[PDB]
Amino acid sequence: ISSLELYKYSIFFRNYIENVAEDCLKNGLILESAAHNVSEVELARLKVQLKNALLNCIISYRFHGIGYVLVKTKDTLIDLEQPVNIELPIGFEYLDYEYVRDLGVDFDHITYKAVKIHKSRLIIYENFDYILKRYVPCYTESFLLDIYLFEKIYVEIERRIENHNFLFYKDESLARLKSNLNNEGMFYTATPSASLEVIKYDLSYLKEALALIKAKIGADTKEPLTRSFNEQAKGLGNDGKGDRSNYYDFLKGVQEQVENSCNLKLTKYFGLDMKFNSLIMLSEEQKVERDIKLIELYSKYNQLIQSSSFNNEELAMLKEKLFSF
Amino acid sequence: ISSLELYKYSIFFRNYIENVAEDCLKNGLILESAAHNVSEVELARLKVQLKNALLNCIISYRFHGIGYVLVKTKDTLIDLEQPVNIELPIGFEYLDYEYVRDLGVDFDHITYKAVKIHKSRLIIYENFDYILKRYVPCYTESFLLDIYLFEKIYVEIERRIENHNFLFYKDESLARLKSNLNNEGMFYTATPSASLEVIKYDLSYLKEALALIKAKIGADTKEPLTRSFNEQAKGLGNDGKGDRSNYYDFLKGVQEQVENSCNLKLTKYFGLDMKFNSLIMLSEEQKVERDIKLIELYSKYNQLIQSSSFNNEELAMLKEKLFSF
Amino acid sequence: ISSLELYKYSIFFRNYIENVAEDCLKNGLILESAAHNVSEVELARLKVQLKNALLNCIISYRFHGIGYVLVKTKDTLIDLEQPVNIELPIGFEYLDYEYVRDLGVDFDHITYKAVKIHKSRLIIYENFDYILKRYVPCYTESFLLDIYLFEKIYVEIERRIENHNFLFYKDESLARLKSNLNNEGMFYTATPSASLEVIKYDLSYLKEALALIKAKIGADTKEPLTRSFNEQAKGLGNDGKGDRSNYYDFLKGVQEQVENSCNLKLTKYFGLDMKFNSLIMLSEEQKVERDIKLIELYSKYNQLIQSSSFNNEELAMLKEKLFSF
Amino acid sequence: ISSLELYKYSIFFRNYIENVAEDCLKNGLILESAAHNVSEVELARLKVQLKNALLNCIISYRFHGIGYVLVKTKDTLIDLEQPVNIELPIGFEYLDYEYVRDLGVDFDHITYKAVKIHKSRLIIYENFDYILKRYVPCYTESFLLDIYLFEKIYVEIERRIENHNFLFYKDESLARLKSNLNNEGMFYTATPSASLEVIKYDLSYLKEALALIKAKIGADTKEPLTRSFNEQAKGLGNDGKGDRSNYYDFLKGVQEQVENSCNLKLTKYFGLDMKFNSLIMLSEEQKVERDIKLIELYSKYNQLIQSSSFNNEELAMLKEKLFSF
C-alpha cells in the first residue's frame, strides 16, 4: 500500500492529514518583536505569510515526518549559505520536501533545488522516533490497511450492483421471451424439465466489515472528525471545567512543538517571538458572565474586610490561599 | 467517471458544489475605500457586481481548482496587457475557466478568448496541493464513485420495477387463459405435470447499499446538507457558546482565503478593501438580551466602585483581568 | 423522460414547480416611486399586476430556465422596438416562453408572437449555469427518474390488484364448480391426482422501492413539502433565534435575484423601486412581547445613567458596544 | 511475537507506549535552585531540555524497562568518567538504550557509544521486578498476543474481501455468458443437470473475536484511551470529590518514581530540585467559586467569634478541629 497513491484516490485520507494543521492555526498567531521597533502594519504582514508557511509545514510533518520553512531575508541567492547573526526577515516560504536534501543533524546545511542554505535560516519541524531511530509520518502500515479496506468496500459494491439479481434459465428444447414478459407478464415454456430461478447476491459481509473497520479507525487516531466520520464536533469549547478533551491535549502538544521549533531560531537569529492563540475562545455572553462573577467575588471580599476584626497575619494568610487575591 | 457528465445528470452533485459558495456570500460583503472619496451609492453598486463575480469564482474553485475574476477599469481591450498602478475600478466580471490559459505563477499574464491580460487586474482563487504539486478540485475519485453508486441504485430499480413479479408457466400440452382469469379468477389446466410459480425479485441488496453509501458520503465531506441528505440544518446559529460547528470552521477558512485573494490586489492596485459579514447573525430578541446583561454588568461595577475602599493599584489590577473593562 | 409529459400526468411534479413561486409572493411586495408623484391608489394597482406577472415568471424560470415579463407603457404595438428613456408604466404582462425568441445577451431585442420588443422593456429572470454554459431548469435527469419511479409504483399496483389472489386448478378428467362452492362451501373432485393451489402476489418490492425513492427525493430538493410528502411545515416562523431553516435561505436567495432583475430596469428606465416583504411575519402577541422587553431595556438604561458616576468617555464607549443605543 | 516488529506495524501499540509519557509531562514541571543564585531565564531553559529528555526516558522505561538521561556539564568528553561533587549543569540529553552498556547496580559506570560515564551524572529510571529478578517492560507476552490478534482480524478481512461472494457454475456440456448477463440480465444454459450457486463468506467469527479481544485489552491495562479505543476521556478533571480515577493514581505513582530518580542526584550533585505540576488543573470559573465559598467561611467564622461568649479553651479547641483554621 502506497501512501501517495492513497492520498490521490481518497479524500478521507486527505482530510485526515490536513485536519490537524487547519485546527492548529484556526485561531491565529501572535507575533512580537523584542526590539519593539518594527511597525505593527509590517509585523502583521509577516504574520500572514508565517501562517501560510506553517500550514504546509505541519502537513509535510504529518505526511513525510519533517517540515522545512525558509526565513527569507534581504540577501542574494548565493548568500543563503552564509549564516545569519541578527536581521529582520522579509517573509516566510515553505520548502517542498521532495526538493530538500538533508544529511542529518550533524550537518548545518541543506541542498534545495542546487542552492546551499544554512540551517540557521530554516525552521525545522521533525518527528524523530528514538525506538526506530528515524523520522516517521503520523501513520503506520496498519492504518493504511484500514483506509484501503474502507475504500475497497465500495469498489466491490460497484462490481456486483448491476447484476445483484438475475435469472438462471434452463431449457434443453430452447427476444421473444422478453417481449411476452414485458406485455403479458407471463413466462411460458413447454419443456417439462425447464427451471427458472432468481440468483441474488448479499451484502452482510460488507456491512459487517464496515462496522469492524470503523472501530479500528477510531482506535488508531485521536482526531474526532476522522473517528466519527464527520459526525462529532471537535470538542474545543468552554465547559467551565478543567476536564479537557483528548483532541485538545493533542492539539496543545502539537502547538508547543511548533512554538519551540519556530522560537529556537526566530528569537536567536531574527529577534522575533511567535505565540499561538488560545484554543478555547470565549463567547461574548461567557465573558459577561465571568465578569459578573468576578465582581461579585470582589464585593464579597470588600464586605468581609470592612466588617471583620481579623488580625493582620490572619488577613494576610487568607490572601495566599485565595486564587484571585 | 467523468465529473462533467456527473454534473449534468445529478442534481445532488450540483448542489454539493454550489452549496458552499451560496453560504459564504449569504450574509453579504462590506466594501470600503481607503481614500474615502468614492460615494456610497457608487460603492454599493460595485459591491453588488463583486458578489455576483465571487459566486462563480468559488464554484470554479471547487469544480476546477482555480477561479478568475476580472477587475474591469476604464480602459480599452488592448490596455488590459498594461499593468495598473492606481485606479478605481468600474466593475467585476467572472472569467470562464475553459477560456483562460495560464502558464503558472512564474508568468504575470494570461490569455483569454486571444486577449492578453496582466495578472495585476485579476483576482485568483486557487487550490494548490503541495503533495500533488498541482491544482485540484474539492472532490477525488473516491467521492465520484460514491455519487455514481448513489445514482446507479435507482437506475437498477427502474430496470426491474415492471417485472418484479411475474408468472412462470410450464405446460407441454398447451388470450383465453387471461380472459378466464380476469372474470372467473380461476386458472385451469388439464396437464398433470403443469406448474405455475410466481417469480419475485428482491431489494435487500439495494437497501443495504444505500446505508453504506450514505455513511461514506458523510465521511467524505463536511457540508451538512450533503451528508444528511438535506435533513440537518447548516448549524450557523447562535448558541451562546464558543463551541462552533465543523461547518462554521470550514466556511470561516474559505472566507479568509477569499479575503486574502481579493485584498492582495484590491488594496495595492485599486485602493479598495473588502470584508465578509459575520457568519453568525443575532436576532432582534438576542440583541436586547445581550444589552440587558451588559447594562447589569455596568450597574454592578458602578455599585462596587462606589461602595468599596480598595486601593488604586487593586482597583487598577481588576480592570485588566476584566474583559469588558 | 419528458418533463412536459410528467407535468401533465403528475400533480406532485406540478406542486414542486409551483410551491417555490407561491411562497416568494405569499407576503406581498412593496412598490415605491422615486419621483414621489404617483398616487398610492394607482401605484397599488400596479403592484397587483406585478405580483400576477411575477408568479408566472418564477414558474417559467423553474420549468424552462428563463422568465420574461413585459412592462407595458402607453405606446403602440410598433413602438415596442424603440427604447425607453423615462416613463411611468401602465402595467405588467407575463410573456409565454414558447412565443419568445431570444438570440442571447449580445442582442438587445427579442421576437414575440412577430413583434420586435426592445430588452429595456423586459424583466428577465434567467438561470445561467457557467459550467454548462447554458440556461437550465431547476430539475435534472436524475430528478425526473425519481418522479417517474414514484408514479410507476402505483401503475404496477393497478396491473395486479384484480388478480393478486387466484386459484390454480389441475384436473385431467374434467359454472357447476362455482355454484357448489358458493352455496355449500365445498369443492369436490374425483380425480386422485387433482390439485388446487392459491397463487399470491407480493408487494415487498414496491414497499421497499418507495422508501428508497422518498430518501432520494429529499436529497434532491430543499422544498420541505416535496421532501416530506406534505407532512412537514415550511419552517418560516419566528423562533427568536438567528438559526434560520434551509428553506428560508433558499427563498431569501430567490427573492434577492428577482429584486435585482426587477430593479435593474424599473429604477433606470421607469423610475420605480420594488421590494419584497419580510419572510418572517410576527404575530400580534409576539409584537407586544418584543415591545415589553424593549421598554424594560430602556428603563434599565435610564436607571443606570441616573444612578452612576461614570466618566463621559466611559458612558460614550458603552453606547457603541450596545446594539439598541 | 516481537515487540519491535509490532511497534513498527501497529500505531495502536505506539500510542499505548507513548500515551503515559505524554500525560505525565502535559502540565509541565517546576525547577528550583537550592543556592537561589541561578537566573530564572537560564533556569527556565534548563527546564525545557529536561522535559524533552524526560519524555524519551519514560518511553524507554515502558518499552525496555530502563531509561537513561545524561546531565551534561561544562566538561570534556574524557571528563565524564570522573565523578561530580557540585556543579550547575548545562543541559540534559537522553541516551539511547541500545548504545548503553550497564553491568548492574554493583557498578558505578556505564559505556556509551566507547565513552565511560560515571553514574553520578546519569538519571536512571528503571523497572526492577523482584519476583523475576530482572528489568521488565510494561507489557507481557499475553498483552502482545492481544495486540497481534487485534491486527490479524483486519488482515483476514483483506484476504477474502474481493471474493466474499462468487458464483459456482457446473456445466458438463460447456465471455459470452457475461455479455448476455450484463445486457439482458438472464443466464441461459441447455444442460438439464447444470447448476448455479452463490458462495458466500461470513464474518461472525471475526465480529465475536473483536468483542473478546477488546475485553482482554481493557483488563490488561489501565490507560483509558487504550481500553476504550479512544472513546473515553482521561478522567483527570476536577469533580469536587476525593474519589480519583484509576488513571490518576497510576499517573501519580509514575510521577513520584520519576521525581525520586531525578532528585536523587540533582539535589546531591547539582544542587537542583524538580517538581511535577498538579495533575488536576482548576478552571478560571472553578477558582472564583472556591474563593467565594472560602470567603463565606471566613465571614461565618468572624460572626461566630463576635457574637458568642465561648471560653478561651473552647474557642481554642474549635481551631484544631477546623481544617481551614
What string of H, E and C letters represents the secondary structure of A235-283? Answer: CCCCCCCCCCCHHHHHHHHHHHHHHHHHHHHHHHHHCEEEEECCCCCCC
Is B205 in contact with A154 (Cβ distance < 8 A)?
no
C-alpha separations of C252 from C70, C248, C258, C259, C260 in Å: 24, 6, 10, 11, 12
Experimental method: cryo-EM
Residue D293 Cα, gap to closest chain A Cα (Å): 10
Nearest partner of B165 among A200, C166, D187, C164, judged by Cα: C164
Per the CB < 8 A criterion, the answer to whether D149 and D137 are in contact is: no
Nearest partner of A291 among C323, D288, B306, judged by Cα: D288
How many whole angstroms separate alpha carbon A309 and alpha carbon B144? 78
Is B154 in contact with C152 (Cβ distance < 8 A)?
no
Is A187 in contact with B167 (Cβ distance < 8 A)?
yes
Q: Which of B141, B213, B243 sits opposite A237 (nearest CB)?
A: B243
Q: Which of C213, C246, C323 sits opposite B287 (nearest CB)?
A: C323
Closest chain B CA to residue C192: B192
Task: Decide: helix, strand or coil at residue B201.
Answer: coil
Pairing of strands A29-33, A66-72: unpaired
Q: Which of B151, B164, B294 sits opposite C322 (nearest CB)?
A: B294
Is D185 in contact with A170 (Cβ distance < 8 A)?
no
Closest chain D CA to residue A203: D165
Q: Which of A48, A204, A287 sits opposite B323 (nearest CB)?
A: A287
- Within 8 A of A187 by CB-CB distance, chain B residues are 166-169, 199
**Virtual CA dihedral for A247, A248, A250, A253, nearest 10 degrees?**
170
Per the CB < 8 A criterion, the answer to whether D274 and D263 are in contact is: yes
D229 sits in the region (left: phi over 0; alpha: psi -120 to 50; else beta) called left
**Do chains C and D touch, with touching meaning 3 or more CB–CB pairs less than 8 Å apart?**
no
**Do chains D and A touch, with touching meaning 3 or more CB–CB pairs less than 8 Å apart?**
yes
Q: Which of B10, B198, B236 sits opposite C201 (nearest CB)?
A: B198
B11-24 and C204-220 are packed helices; what angle lies between their axes, rounded to 10 degrees?
A: 30
How many whole angstroms separate alpha carbon D169 and alpha carbon D172? 10
C-alpha separations of C113 from A286, C101, D172 in Å: 65, 9, 73
Residue A247: all three cell numbers together: 483532541
Q: Which long-range contacts (CB under 8 A, 24 or more apart) does A253-258 make?
A: A253/D22, A253/D26, A254/A20, A254/A24, A254/A58, A255/A24, A255/A279, A257/A125, A258/A24, A258/A54, A258/A57, A258/A58, A258/A125
Per the CB < 8 A criterion, the answer to whether C277 and C30 are in contact is: yes
Give the contacts of B273 (CB within 8 A, at least 6 positions apart): B31, B32, B33, B34, B263, B266, B267
Task: Decide: helix, strand or coil at residue D187.
Answer: strand
- Within 8 A of B56 by CB-CB distance, chain C residues are 130
Is B246 in contact with A233 (Cβ distance < 8 A)?
yes
Report the greatest alpha carbon distance in chain D: 116
Q: Which of B141, B205, B240 sits opposite A285 (nearest CB)?
A: B240
- Within 8 A of B206 by CB-CB distance, chain C residues are 208, 212
Is B191 in contact with C170 (Cβ distance < 8 A)?
yes
Q: Which of B132, B148, B246 sits opposite A230 (nearest CB)?
A: B246
Binding partners of A (≥3 Cβ pairs within 8 A): B, D
How many whole angstroms separate alpha carbon A42 and alpha carbon A31? 11
Strand-pair partners of D93 = D70
Q: Which of D50, D96, D97, D158 to mutate to test binding with chain A, by most A CBs within 10 Å of its CB? A: D158
C-alpha separations of D79 from B141, C59, D68, D90 in Å: 62, 92, 18, 15
CB-count exposure of residue B200 (10 Å: 0-12, 13-18, 19+): middle
Is C212 in contact with B158 (Cβ distance < 8 A)?
no
Q: Which of D2, D7, D14 to mutate to test binding with chain A, by most A CBs within 10 Å of its CB? A: D14
Give the contacts of B187 (CB within 8 A, at least 6 positions apart): B177, B180, B181, B196, C166, C167, C168, C169, C199
DSSP assigned state of D278: P
Residue D295 Cα, gap to closest chain A Cα (Å): 7
Residue D42 Cα, gap to closest chain A Cα (Å): 14
Alpha helices in chain C (DSSP H): 3-9, 11-24, 40-63, 141-160, 176-183, 204-220, 224-227, 246-270, 284-306, 312-320
φ and ψ at residue D72, rounded to 5 degrees:
-80, 135
Strand-pair partners of D200 = D165
DSSP assigned state of C67: E
Exposure string over D66-81, b if 16+ CB within 10 A, otherwise e: bbbbbbebeeeeeebe
Binding partners of B (≥3 Cβ pairs within 8 A): A, C
Task: Decide: helix, strand or coil at residue A108.
Answer: coil
Exposure string over C265-304, b if 16+ CB within 10 A, otherwise e: bbeebbbbebebeebeeeeeeeeeebeeeeeebeebbeeb
Sheet holding B195-200, edge to edge: A186-189, B165-170, B195-200
Is A229 in contact with B213 (Cβ distance < 8 A)?
no
- Within 8 A of B222 by CB-CB distance, chain A residues are 225, 230
Residue C215: all three cell numbers together: 430518501
Beta strand spans in D149-245 (E): 165-170, 186-189, 195-200
Is B142 in contact with A12 (Cβ distance < 8 A)?
yes
Closest chain D CA to residue A143: D11
∠ CA(A258), CA(A259), CA(A261), 5° rounding? Answer: 65
Is C143 in contact with B11 (Cβ distance < 8 A)?
yes
Is D201 in contact with A205 (Cβ distance < 8 A)?
yes
Closest chain D CA to residue A244: D237
How many whole angstroms separate alpha carbon A142 and alpha carbon A145? 5
Is D229 in contact with A241 (Cβ distance < 8 A)?
no
Is D302 in contact with A310 (Cβ distance < 8 A)?
yes
How many whole angstroms separate alpha carbon D27 and alpha carbon D224? 18
CB-count exposure of residue B30 (10 Å: 0-12, 13-18, 19+): exposed
Q: Which of B131, B259, B263 to mutate to test binding with chain A, by most A CBs within 10 Å of its CB? A: B131
- Within 8 A of D190 by CB-CB distance, chain A residues are 170-172, 174
Closest chain A CA to residue D282: A242
Is A153 in contact with B212 (Cβ distance < 8 A)?
yes
- Residue identified by cell 438475475 is A166
Residue type, A170: K
How many whole angstroms separate alpha carbon A4 and alpha carbon A26? 26
- Residue B72 has a CB neighbour count (10 Å cut-off) of 15
- Residue identified by cell 481579493 is B262
Q: Which long-range contacts (CB under 8 A, 24 or more apart) does A157-160 make?
A: A157/A203, A157/A206, A157/B149, A157/B209, A157/B212, A157/B213, A158/B145, A158/B148, A158/B149, A158/B152, A160/A201, A160/D165
C-alpha separations of D56 from A131, A211, D59 in Å: 9, 36, 5
How many whole angstroms separate alpha carbon C212 and alpha carbon C191? 49
**Total CB pairs under 8 A between chain A and B:** 213
Is B290 in contact with A281 (Cβ distance < 8 A)?
no
How many whole angstroms separate alpha carbon D210 and alpha carbon A213? 11
Closest chain C CA to residue B64: C131
CB-count exposure of residue C219 (10 Å: 0-12, 13-18, 19+): buried
φ and ψ at residue C220, rounded to 5 degrees:
-95, 0
How many whole angstroms separate alpha carbon C58 and alpha carbon C254? 9
How many whole angstroms separate alpha carbon A138 and alpha carbon A134? 13
CB-count exposure of residue A96 (10 Å: 0-12, 13-18, 19+): middle
Q: Which of A94, A154, A288 sits opposite B216 (nearest CB)?
A: A154
Q: Which of A1, A142, A177 to mutate to test binding with chain D, by most D CBs within 10 Å of its CB? A: A142
How many whole angstroms separate alpha carbon A48 and alpha carbon B283? 33
Residue C299: all three cell numbers together: 428603563
∠ CA(A58), CA(B19), CA(A9), 5° rounding? Answer: 45
Task: Decide: helix, strand or coil at residue B191.
Answer: coil
**Total CB pairs under 8 A between chain B and C:** 212
Q: Which of D282, D290, D298 sits opposite A242 (nearest CB)?
A: D282
- Within 8 A of B282 by CB-CB distance, chain C residues are 242, 323
Alpha carbon of residue B79 to chain centroid: 35
- Within 8 A of A213 by CB-CB distance, chain D residues are 154, 157
Going C144 to C145 to C151 to C152, the CA torsion angle's sign is positive
Residue A221 Cα, gap to closest chain B Cα (Å): 15
Per the CB < 8 A criterion, the answer to whether A216 and D152 are in contact is: no
How many whole angstroms separate alpha carbon A196 and alpha carbon D188? 10
